[PDB]
């Protein structure tokens, strides 16, 4: 809810930015009634996972929208902080009870391909080093190659 909107402003609207704290575009995006409803849906429901808040700069105005839906808009520098725990609120174990995803302001297809090549395949690599994971790694490599070939 409100805590989820504060988390959105503090974390999600920070992708293309550099280092600091919550901006005014983050507050304007997260203060929407749809933004509050999506934040509450992530707060209570476990199926409603992703919450995206963007600090956009379109032709360079600081204006964007925060919602559960994640889409590639005009410099939409959102970040889908998805939820894997049953609820999203305060008292229990910290926001390590979430799901991790990052997005860029431009088209996120190449960003997702690079993420799969450099951290999703590396996640299975780290798991194998700790230990169908090789199938996941080979198929992620094939998916990255297909994404690169389709974008090129």
């Amino acid at each position: 809810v409100s805590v989820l909107q504060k988390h959105l402003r503090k974390l999600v609207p920070l992708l293309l930015e550099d280092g600091g704290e919550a901006p005014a575009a983050l507050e304007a995006a997260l203060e929407e009634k749809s933004a509050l409803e999506q934040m509450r849906k992530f707060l209570s429901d476990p199926q409603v996972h992703t919450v995206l808040v963007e600090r956009s700069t379109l032709k360079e105005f600081i204006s964007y929208n925060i919602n559960i839906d994640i889409h590639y808009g005009v410099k939409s520098n959102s970040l889908a902080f998805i939820k894997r725990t049953p609820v999203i609120d305060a008292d229990k174990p910290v926001s390590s009870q979430l799901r991790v995803l990052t997005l860029s302001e431009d088209s996120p297809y190449e960003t997702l391909h690079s993420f799969i090549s450099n951290a999703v395949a590396p996640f299975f690599k780290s798991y194998i080093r700790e230990s169908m994971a090789p199938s996941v790694e080979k198929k992620i490599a094939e998916l990255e190659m297909g994404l690169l070939h389709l974008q090129q």
């Binding site: 049953p86 609820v87 008292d91 229990k92």
Partner: protein, 242 residues
């Protein structure tokens, strides 16, 4: 602090019950016997979660949390736990996962043994569908029995040289492979019938059961063709001798 601890304990019990029921031992998990074992294990985990929730210490913790105003925490722990659902799943698997038809189908390398194992798997699936076990679970059990029969027939053919045998021996091995494939098909038909009956009796939840079937018809066709080729070679040799 005590109310917060009780709410945290209720939430942890709900999460533990969710973890116990999360390992869905449906027909997609292994063979028919493997799926029955997975369903029994899921029912046992749900029963363990329900027992941990309904024990005297957990009940005292829930009462302390309720006295501390943790009604939302208690409701979340009760909803996420599903002890009653796990107990119902265990009770349904009680009349569904008791038999071992898939093991009989896998061990019966002969066509009759494979058909008997498939029939046992299908009968266990039909009994489960009659009980609280799902018609889909019965169809999964029948399909696992048929697949085990087909795998056993393929293993027997590979070991005894059903394909690699000569005229007579290859014809016999191909006949055994065809019998194993037919036994797997019959067990799949029985499992599908039991799943359809369970779905008919449980139309509120189960629409119908899976076709079950088996996975070897190609092996039986190859064995019949090999026997026919041995017969044709014998005929060609007889014609050459004449």
């Amino acid at each position: 602090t005590f109310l917060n601890q009780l709410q945290s304990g209720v939430n942890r019990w709900i999460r533990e019950i969710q973890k116990v029921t999360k390992l869905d031992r449906d027909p997609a998990s292994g063979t028919a016997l493997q799926e029955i074992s997975f369903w029994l294990n899921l029912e046992r985990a749900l029963y363990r979660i329900q027992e941990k929730r309904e024990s005297p210490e957990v009940l005292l913790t829930l009462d302390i949390l309720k006295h501390g105003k943790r009604f939302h925490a208690t409701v979340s722990f009760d909803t996420d736990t599903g002890l009653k659902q796990a107990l119902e799943t265990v009770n349904d698997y009680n009349p569904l996962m008791k038999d071992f038809p898939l093991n009989d189908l896998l061990s019966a390398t002969e066509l009759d043994k494979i058909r008997q194992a498939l029939v046992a798997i299908f009968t266990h699936l039909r009994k489960i569908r009659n009980t609280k076990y799902p018609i889909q679970r019965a169809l999964r059990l029948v399909e696992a029995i048929s697949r085990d029969l087909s795998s056993q027939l393929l293993k027997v053919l590979g070991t005894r040289k059903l394909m690699h045998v000569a005229y007579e021996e290859f014809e016999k091995v191909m006949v055994a492979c065809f019998e194993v494939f037919q036994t797997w098909d019959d067990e799949y038909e029985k499992l599908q019938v039991l799943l359809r009956d369970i779905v008919k009796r449980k139309r509120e939840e189960n629409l119908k059961m899976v076709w079950r079937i088996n996975p070897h018809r190609k092996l039986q066709a190859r064995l019949d063709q090999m026997r026919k080729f041995r017969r044709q070679h014998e005929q060609l040799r007889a014609v050459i001798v004449r």
